[PDB]
Ligand binder design. Structure first.
Ligand code: NAI
Ligand code: NAI
Ligand code: NAI
Ligand code: UPG
Ligand code: UPG
Ligand code: UPG
Ligand code: CL
Ligand code: CL
Ligand code: CL
Lengths: 460, 458, 460
């Protein structure tokens, strides 16, 4: 059986950095080198201030860095020396050309495939961790086959990642499962077992699934679609609850106690964000169209359409509640990250809600405990941002003279704010729009203070 | 207040089993199940029950005549009752306003009127039937308009979550019990009295209490979520066939995420049963009424996907058989909507059969539990010319071009496929709409079958 | 090299009878037997009154029948003894089930394939002359492979037919080309060559095309589509001519003098009929949808949609011209055949125009020199036919007390009728609607007599 002792990971982002840190942590006899074209990002990984915020990550990195974990811009030498090469680069939705707004952009994957074969001799296992369309591994195999050399044997595997940001270290150290796809061939199965042996340093063999490459690729897309669907489903129930006078939290409990349904991922919200759910569902939708499966495409499209509607209707609830006009009105936005326990803003509902209110000419004052002010400015930019956006140092500044407080991210602190103080300095009537249900069981207290408090999944 | 006599209006798949379990678990409570259908009631009182449900016969026989009764005497049962369950059918309307979408509430209203005509004193009236949101209000309003001195009728909601085939297990060990009633003192005293019945065998922590309209919405939502899981995995099955992935491998990968869970990810020709479609349509119909067109279109997809899965399965059979099935003998194995039941209501088997009958195929249908008279009714001329009901599966496959498995009965995987092949016309096809032949494909191919299944590429 | 000495043809219709008649005529050393389930049809083929009207056919049949041409209902023995079996059974559009109104119905084809394999031993060539969807020959091959016998060796070819009814004998004796499809394998090419050898008794080798079975099948569908398209195209121009004061016959001449366009099939009409154009084009459209080609599907659907419009707008013109009401009005329909020189009515525009007028309650009196009166009854039946339809022994009976005369088939005789006499006994104002342009150059005389004369592609 083949022993992997040098790993190169191309892409030092939210997947590459944490995944490799944990491998290095659990496998002291393997040298793990994380590489990237982004020099500032690599430099930050090698510093006391990491380029991303992830609970527990700093402790894992500092235990290994310089011992068997390395971060470098020297991609070529990392590849050359590696037994196993992870492709962990970004796969954003195409914003141009064929399949604009739907198709996955594979330019970064392709650039990796080309650089690997340019710098490779002998045997390596090339492992696609990035989320890709079904059959993308076949393209990598084709690039490798077309640029073959004597004794070049590059084995291609799929090894999708299932970590959630904010819980990355926990999920990596105790994953519900690890999924690996490869050919049925002897060489394919030898590559698969080599990678299994890495994970078996800390993951039980019973929790490692092996399949073919296509099942692996699809499984990842399908898993995200099912998860995203659970959220769009409970959000659609939230709108029904508001209309009928039921409570989505109480309905969710009754639904969730059916063990066939399960009780996870039933928290209604202003809408799901994050870099992956939207793009991965749209990837699936684009694939179906391309494979003559239009019924399946319109089935999954509804997950996105419902999410977009949830956001849109939350925005219109704000504008309607504020006497149908918010032009020149100060509105506090509490939370910009796409979920708590991350500084990541990619596809955050906070962006979308902010842009809907900016379209009305509202004056937004945005606070988040973890997101850097520079990123907020970038996210809201194409000006409008200079005229309409202020980034606040604390939530009290943001609410000072506000007509409305809009909670978009479920940071623990928002529940604990001094709302009596806030009320005194808000313009009147003062509104709170809770897009996260974090103020449940404070409604009586807030109403006594004098707020009009509105939340998703509860009738006004 | 202690409930000592229970009446249940509706002696069907819900009223019969629910009451039988109540009687079995509460020997001090007299439970009377009533119905307008005399022959159904007569069957409940016979050695051959009107429905097939595992474990039901043994429960009925342990209580019937002691504290469990089946009767067409609806009036006296209501008169004497402390608690009256409403457990009549709520089919989709096949006429008028909301044809093909809205719930038909004529049987519910008939119950409400009969109760108020035959009641004096205090009673708790509990709607267990799956009804639109705010339906319990209509019963309340009927009662308030028809008061009598010392008449005090309390209205609750108590949705049912059992699945047919597993009814007795589900009833004896429910994941939860859901009860809705008014926030008033009288309302809460009614709710507590019903809780007290369930607490003879159900832990109090598993009993959820709320208002009638939240209870009603929860039932419709739970069914929509369940149906959605099936439509979702069925949508993935189509993708698998197109990409060389295997839906069972994909389902396993998906299901190991504990946030997703591993239940209800079995791909099929399509979900059947009297309730999933009609309850999703009820929910969709409500959305339109409430000005929620986006929510309506979201949930409509669960139904549109199910209809596509069935349609493409039928089209696969016709295409594989050289684009013509006119006069071709074809075996339908499984007519029940799932295994462990004789119930055929909305079975995918009915839809597939009708598609093949539309082509003029000669169907030979076999099911171990569905009565032959029910299959004739479901498919109903065209039935006389095209449909034969087979006593056994070998009769069904004799001289057939294709074998179509629609119901996951255990016996179909255990058949002698060498024997079947010998007397089939050639080429011989098997279309496995339940994935019950997995891991026999190599053997079946070597025998000479073209074998096709959902979620696997041909 | 294999010599075909006995031919069996299954299907004694407008293809099977004439095609076999000509083979026998040109190949006196080959025994040719045409078979059919329709006993009265076979009986007629053996009588002095043939079951179809086709110029020159009677002479060809009588020069060979009883010598090397036979017609029989003994299908089994004819298959058993044949070296070559033609399948020339009907392939109508399905009126039921999957693909209703679009897909080809292949039940008759399959009945033939099954009958051939059960009655065959040794070597035979099986040739699909019926017009079939692409890949239909693959289905026959599969049926044969699944039902082997020791020594049985059946080879499958495509050999589409290109004859037009009314000119079948000329078309068969001097075809523009012969098309044969077969497998690239040695056995298939020996099969293909054997069939060529038959045709080479009277067709130049240069005019015989050979290919695979699917390119052959597709070429036949495509050829009919291109033909039907020229007619719908000139008919579209006929509508424009009426609207702009141009004449479609002069525009057709000008267009047709471009040798790249060519001057055939540019005769505007009420619309194309015949058993094949519509069904063959719809077959093509259905195939497109199955192959995920919706653009190609809508492209060819326009040929049919234009034809439907040409018919409808001609019926509307009659109704609008007759003061917007034809209930109880006697109207003469001259010509029921789908074109001249045939007794065939299948998909005749005369059927459609009749049905539109019957839907109004008009009293139709129908005349055709060749079509049997019982076929006209059958065609207009779903009663209505009893109440509204009279079949006339001569055209003057049809026009007697009529309000309008509608020419739907281009029989030479209609141009030659005594229109002064017709006018005297018609109701007034008397109308002529020429759906075939056979009355061109008579418009001045007709108007002088008193008729309002209207025609396709000429402004009123
Ligand atoms: N963020 C998440 O929670 C998870 C993401 N995924 C998937 O993992 C992949 C990566 O996601 P993230 O790490 O969030 O993206 P990211 O954008 O944060 O990181 C990707 C990194 O790859 C680098 N890169 C791109 N092309 C390169 C090249 N040719 N050579 C060297 N470096 C290159 C970029 O500079 C960037 O730093 C995606 O395919 C995503 O769908 C999977 C599971 C979790
Ligand atoms: N079948 C199932 O697995 C479950 C059904 N439900 C719900 O339970 C309700 C009943 O379902 P089933 O038992 O399947 O229906 P069913 O049709 O099998 O039985 C209902 C019975 O009520 C009787 N009935 C109708 N009107 C009556 C009246 N006015 N007086 C006396 N009897 C009358 C009918 O004759 C029938 O026998 C429905 O609302 C359904 O949605 C809920 C959970 C499970
Ligand atoms: N009519 C035309 O101008 C042309 C027709 N074609 C094609 O040729 C085929 C036949 O056309 P037609 O001769 O007009 O059809 P048709 O309907 O006039 O004749 C077909 C004959 O086949 C017989 N038949 C059907 N099933 C049979 C079976 N199982 N055993 C024995 N006989 C059977 C019918 O009884 C009928 O007499 C069609 O596929 C058509 O598309 C091709 C070129 C020209
Ligand atoms: O019940 C819920 C659960 C989540 N969300 C929101 O949904 C989005 C996604 O949350 P989460 O799934 O927890 O984080 P992600 O980092 O997006 O992780 C998802 O996306 C990853 C990248 O593909 C996968 O690896 C993970 O398994 C999958 O959970 C966030 O905006 C959450 O606030 C809700 O609104 N309600
Ligand atoms: O993974 C799965 C699970 C189910 N089914 C099919 O879905 C239909 C319904 O199955 P099931 O839910 O097991 O039975 P039902 O009797 O229809 O029970 C449903 O409907 C009842 C009436 O509302 C509810 O009370 C139950 O909780 C709910 O499961 C049947 O055709 C099943 O074969 C699948 O195809 N795949
Ligand atoms: O310029 C024209 C030519 C034809 N037609 C009408 O088009 C229909 C078809 O005419 P035609 O093609 O001459 O006779 P078909 O017997 O239908 O022959 C066609 O259909 C056959 C069956 O496939 C093919 O084999 C022939 O090549 C093809 O011409 C008839 O209603 C004609 O009157 C016109 O209106 N204008
Ligand atoms: Cl916080
Ligand atoms: Cl069984
Ligand atoms: Cl003539």
């Amino acid at each position: 059986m083949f022993e992997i002792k040098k790993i190169c990971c191309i892409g030092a982002g939210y997947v590459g950095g944490p995944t490799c840190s944990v491998i290095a942590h659990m496998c002291p006899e393997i040298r793990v080198t994380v590489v990237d074209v982004n020099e500032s990002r690599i430099n930050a990984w090698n510093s006391p201030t990491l380029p991303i915020y992830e609970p527990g990550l700093k402790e894992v990195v500092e235990s290994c860095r310089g011992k068997n974990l390395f971060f470098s811009t020297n991609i070529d030498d990392a590849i050359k020396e590696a037994d196993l090469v992870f492709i962990s680069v970004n796969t954003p939705t195409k914003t141009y050309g064929m399949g604009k707004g739907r198709a996955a952009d594979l330019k970064y994957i392709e650039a990796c495939a080309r650089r690997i074969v340019q710098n490779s001799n002998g045997y390596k296992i090339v492992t696609e961790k990035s989320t890709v369309p079904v059959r993308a591994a076949e393209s990598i195999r084709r690039i490798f086959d077309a640029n073959t050399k004597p004794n070049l044997n590059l084995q291609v595997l799929s090894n999708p990642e299932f970590l959630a940001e904010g819980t990355a270290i926990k999920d990596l150290k105790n994953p519900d499962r690890v999924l690996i796809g490869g050919d049925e061939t002897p060489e394919g199965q030898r590559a698969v077992q080599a990678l299994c042996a890495v994970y078996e340093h800390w993951v039980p063999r019973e929790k490692i699934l092996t399949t073919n490459t296509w099942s692996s690729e699809l499984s990842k897309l399908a898993a995200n679609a099912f998860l995203a669907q659970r959220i769009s489903s409970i959000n659609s129930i939230s709108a029904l609850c508001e209309a009928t006078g039921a409570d989505v939290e109480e309905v969710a409990t009754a639904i969730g106690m059916d063990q066939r349904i399960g009780n996870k991922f039933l928290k209604a919200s202003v809408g799901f964000g994050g870099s992956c759910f939207q793009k991965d569902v749209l990837n699936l939708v684009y694939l179906c169209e391309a494979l003559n499966l239009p019924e399946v495409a319109r089935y999954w499209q509804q997950v996105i359409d419902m999410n977009d509607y949830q956001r849109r209707r939350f925005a219109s609830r704000i504008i309607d509640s504020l006497f149908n006009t918010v032009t020149d009105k100060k509105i506090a936005i509490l939370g910009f990250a796409f979920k708590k326990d991350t500084g990541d803003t990619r596809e955050s509902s906070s962006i979308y809600i902010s842009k809907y209110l900016m379209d009305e000419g509202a004056h937004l004052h945005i606070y988040d405990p973890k997101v850097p002010r520079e990123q907020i400015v970038v996210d809201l930019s194409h000006d409008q941002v200079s005229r309409l956006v202020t980034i606040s140092k604390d939530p009290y500044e943001a609410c000072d003279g506000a007509h409305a407080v809009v909670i978009c991210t479920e940071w623990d602190m928002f529940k604990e704010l001094d709302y009596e103080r806030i009320h005194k300095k808000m313009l009147k009537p003062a509104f709170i729009f809770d897009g996260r249900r974090v103020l449940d069981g404070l409604h009586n207290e807030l109403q006594t203070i004098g707020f009009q408090i509105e939340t998703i999944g509860k009738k006004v």
